[model samples]
Target chain A: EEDAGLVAEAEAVAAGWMLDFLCLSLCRAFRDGRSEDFRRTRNSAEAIIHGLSSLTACQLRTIYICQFLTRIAAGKTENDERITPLESALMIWGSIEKEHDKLHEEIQNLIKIQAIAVCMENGNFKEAEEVFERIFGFKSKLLMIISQKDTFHSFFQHFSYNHMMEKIKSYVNYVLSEKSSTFLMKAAAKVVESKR
Target chain B: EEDAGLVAEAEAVAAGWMLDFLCLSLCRAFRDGRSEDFRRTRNSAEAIIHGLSSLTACQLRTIYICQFLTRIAAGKTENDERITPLESALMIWGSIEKEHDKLHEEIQNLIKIQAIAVCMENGNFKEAEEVFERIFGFKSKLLMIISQKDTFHSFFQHFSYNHMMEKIKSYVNYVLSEKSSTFLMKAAAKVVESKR
Candidate 1:
């Protein structure tokens, strides 16, 4: 029994090592500006995704989607390949939204924020504005829920609601004026400035 | 005035682009399992670290740290030389914790968790256990704070605190066992099973 426990412990350590290795490698790639390396990391991530799927861990699925989305949002992939991962990630997120409406809305809003940022980066102001519109749709729904004194209001404070909406507007205006550089800097500044 | 706004916008956009580019590349390196490529990515991260250090905005620091931590927590660099990035990241995180106690505590906790996980993988169980102990120390302190008003019980409702602790303990035990398969699947399975 002791030996069994020891063996199990060792394997766990290896698994942890694998995760650590992947985390470190991913960070280094981002730090070094190596787009091609993302392709390689994606394969490992796929393995992980498969593992999680096999385990039927739905929460891990969300974690995977977020990880992929973050990667795509970062835009390290080659220009031509960028949309593939982004679309794949959206597809997964969309699928998840069908069953868990609340989670769906939450992730959708997050994706919308990121999408707006992406479109603005490419100088696609109209597309960026459309994403903002979607965010507003969600915002309105959320406000209505709050007006009804829904319990969900407790989940989100007034400040968070206002802050998210303001951010969406900021990006919308920043995108509309064709002022790409300053907009990106501000966006980057926001990202760089967050407590996380 | 319009020109100035435009200029600011462009600069902002450029900054966002650089950050995105950097993050994406790092993700790629990890996904692809390219160690040498990861080294290059680490260099880029170093540049950002240095650049951000000169900036006055706390948000910028946060963003930079988020990106840095995400990458670090994700995995290790493939190239031996790139290991320095991990050390640098730990150092930066340490400094951040020193300056911001509450926020830094969480970050420090995260770093210790990763450090223990990494050490375990490298077959350095003693060191890994030490890190794990530190993590538990924080957990205990947090529990004490919450205990003042039954906040600890409330927190437990939302989190599997004991499960997490057990998982870490199992991991530590695995690392200490010499017969533990540091490299094989059978040994790994035991560790993973223990988590279950």
Candidate 2:
């Protein structure tokens, strides 16, 4: 039993180092804007994915968290030269939308937010705003649910809802402050006026 | 086309950042020994896992690379706490193992090495030596695979195999040179002499 415990500890240490290395590599690939580097990063990502196949749901989830950050970092570095990563991301999202209907609410909200952001960046303010409104509506409904329930036992009841809301607020602020957002908003306003 | 490209780019950025934030949180949680923090990290990991469920096989594989590192890191930390992340990891692995077998191989090797490390740490040299031999055997098989393959198409074919080997070597050396290793070997020698 003691031997088992020690082995577990060592494995954990090794696993931690591996995670750090992958995250750093991913960040570097995105920040550098090197397509070749992205390729390598992607390769590494694939290896990790394969490794994850043997893990349990909880373990898989933990791994997922790391991938989430790597994805966020890689996405943040916008490069005009290569759009493969972005394309790859969208394709991934599309696939997720098809399978796994029982996903946590937090994931649903995140996907919605990402969808809106993508639309806005692509100069489709009309679509982006629609998505935004839909997401807002979902949030309102959630609030109502919480209010009606004497005790909320769902995992999201703890922190995810608030966390996601914060993310949405900050994301909106970032978008609005960017020149692209400004142009998109103006274009959206014009469209609204024309409809009126 | 430009619009689609722009949207993809934006979403990718968001995804990458999410991954980074989640990873940082997990690392902090592990270091602090906070259950709540780890729980939060687990949630984040789940969200990412769900998110990946939408990705194409190739894209999913890419994200998996980073996820592996994160899981390992979290696993290492938990191992330090005498908690096995393997239970959780295996749950996820079980779901996807059919489509992706390389993960099984990598994880198996990792487990063997870890088990051996434990024996060495606790002065069980015979067990440790047996474990090391198994690890070495696996490593040799991997090396042979690499040599035979022309392009090394899959993720494990190249990066994971090589990286895992490097880690194993370092770990083995550590076990051999550390006081723990010396003590264990001596104890084993004595046990053998007593039997004679």
Candidate 3:
């Protein structure tokens, strides 16, 4: 038993170190702007992808995460890079929400926020508005989180944070004011009842 | 192209965040003593193992590293935990040496040092000596690195460092002294020539 355990341990150590090495190499490549080096390393990773035959859902999710990181590091353009990481994160969340509903709503809201930011960054405010309205279609639970910059900061970068705020401001002014008129009409009805 | 890039970026973000999320969860589990939680999370990742098809060398390497880290964190016993990580690290170094000779010799020496420590910890001095002799069989370039604690520290922990120095001292006493007899014999020959 001890011998088997020891052999298992040795094999495990060998495996762990390999991942750590690859991670460090990717980071080094990303940091050093050795794009070619990063790509070569990435290509090398691609070569080893086949033997991974029988994974569970959790393992697939991890691969997606790692793959997302690789693409983010490998990104060529600035906007493209940032945008891709968000998208990768969304899929991960999407899967999580599907299998585990505990964080489902939060994931959905975050996805919308990401989409809004993505659309806005791509100069598609109309598309952004479409996603933005879905969140605002009801009194959003997200509003409380959005109103507080600190809470909002956890999930977004500077660009998304600022844009979300801008969207919120306009929503309050345009959408909420229209809702306020209905409140005024109700108040007007109560005034008539008082007169009666 | 724009739509494809956008989709790709989103997927990548989802993936990256998932990995990041998993990484964070593992860290949280480790720190919080949520051992069961950690186990659960690891098992979740294990569930994600298959479908990792057609990966490059770099990707497989990364997986190995991740797997090693997972095992390290998931270790039930202290010594077992640390030892496994080292073994995992060794395999990573081993594969790298095989494919890329640039770091081969350095890795071999480090492997011996690790073996020495592992043996000492296991109370297997006889086996350790077997490995130790291979390193000292010839005039070793490792002597300089082994002698300096800082350089040695890079590749080994505290136990290995102290033990290695102790071994180095004893080697100089017993092994080198036996070799020194030949040096003195040569000096005696020089003296004989002078006398003649």
Candidate 4:
């Protein structure tokens, strides 16, 4: 119990340091942190904002949060105390109205995506497209977060397409060390061209 | 062994689903995923890009990635099986000669921040500040995550002052069931005027 309490305290402090420097707005978001310091922070917010634009890249919040994110994923692996797969699948995402704290948009988006997934599973591509379309204006901040792109999205018949082909080819190399017909449209193409 | 193989297979499928529907670009980035579908996705990239633009609004990746980040943090916690603290601290960030993979900017930012932390530890706030200043052209994507406030930084010694006092008074109410000397910095305090 004592050990757990210490760990929890340490975690809090670590979390606090993260907020203190990364974005005090997170601190401002919370009750304990709304102290006099927050007000000081608010006054400094604009200057801080200007400084942040000026704040160098390749440091702090991004990496620290990534590490934090890794910790969350690993914990889930351990949390596989699930009595079943369905139960476990139910526990993911960002927010819900029931979850009054933090932005609820993330989880809501996840729920929507999952719905799309289900529609896809049921061969409801049209329905899924409609569902996916609904989120068009959403601008998810998942990595920036979602804003950065949970969602790296696309490529096409050339530069982007070639880029993607290079990747999948390499993937095939890794997975089977051979070719895969499951990849492209075979029937419509010529014999050698009908390749995976 | 059989079960492990089955587990691996399932994990791969889930991961594939993740790569397929969501971030195909992440897939293309890797050498292994370079397959035939890569070509098809090319035509789809713009469509994918369009969908992704619409795909906005959040969830899954944020939480899922958070978990992964947790694992990284935990691994470090265990690496505290470390022979030393300084050593563990060194293992973080991005560059292009740089962090080419992942969000290079974020990890790069993280690496720099860690460096600053080290500088702080060495009583080199001046050096750290210089380093922080060096990245002045950068805009942190964080608060963009929250309140969507980019370039939305700070306050007066007062409104921020009032905002913070408001938080504390609220805190005091919760803590001791009362208020604080912090509140009522009010507007035009040239008078006892404007209040919340």
- TM-score leader: 1
Superposed by TM-score, candidate 4 places the C-alpha of residue B79 at a distance from the truth, in angstroms, of 5.0
Enumerate the candidates' DockQ scores in order: 0.10, 0.02, 0.02, 0.01
lDDT of 4 by residue, B50-105 (tens): 21212212223322222222222322123333211222222322111222554444
lDDT, candidate 3, B102-168, per-residue tens? 3444444544566545555555555445545654562253343333322333445643544433432
| B5: Cα error in model 3, Å | 33
Can you write out model 2's per-residue Cα lDDT over B1-196, one digit (the tens) per residue? 1243343343343343334434433444443445564565555444444323255553453244334434544443333533233333333444442444564565555544444443433555554455445445556653443344322335343344345435533433332343233221233334444544
Better of 1 and 4 by TM-score: 1
TM-scores of the models, in the order given: 0.26, 0.24, 0.25, 0.16
Native contact recovery (fnat) for each candidate is 0.25, 0.00, 0.00, 0.00
Q: Tell me the TM-score of candidate 2's A chain.
A: 0.34
Better of 1 and 3 by TM-score: 1
lDDT of 1 by residue, A66-181 (tens): 36434443531244443433344455556642365554455545554444444544655554455445445466654454345342344344324344434333433422333222
- The CAPRI classification for model 1 reads as incorrect
Off by over 4 Å in 2: A1-196, B1-53, B74-83, B86-107, B116-196
Best by DockQ: 1
Ordering by TM-score: 1, 3, 2, 4
Q: Encode model 3's per-residue lDDT on A41-152: one tens digit a residue.
A: 4543343233234545634543443464464443222545434444544455456313444344444454456655555556555544554565456235434443332333
- The clash numbers for all candidates, in the given order, read 55, 50, 53, 66
CAPRI-style quality class for the chain A–B interface of candidate 3: incorrect
Chain A only: TM-score per candidate:
0.38, 0.34, 0.38, 0.20
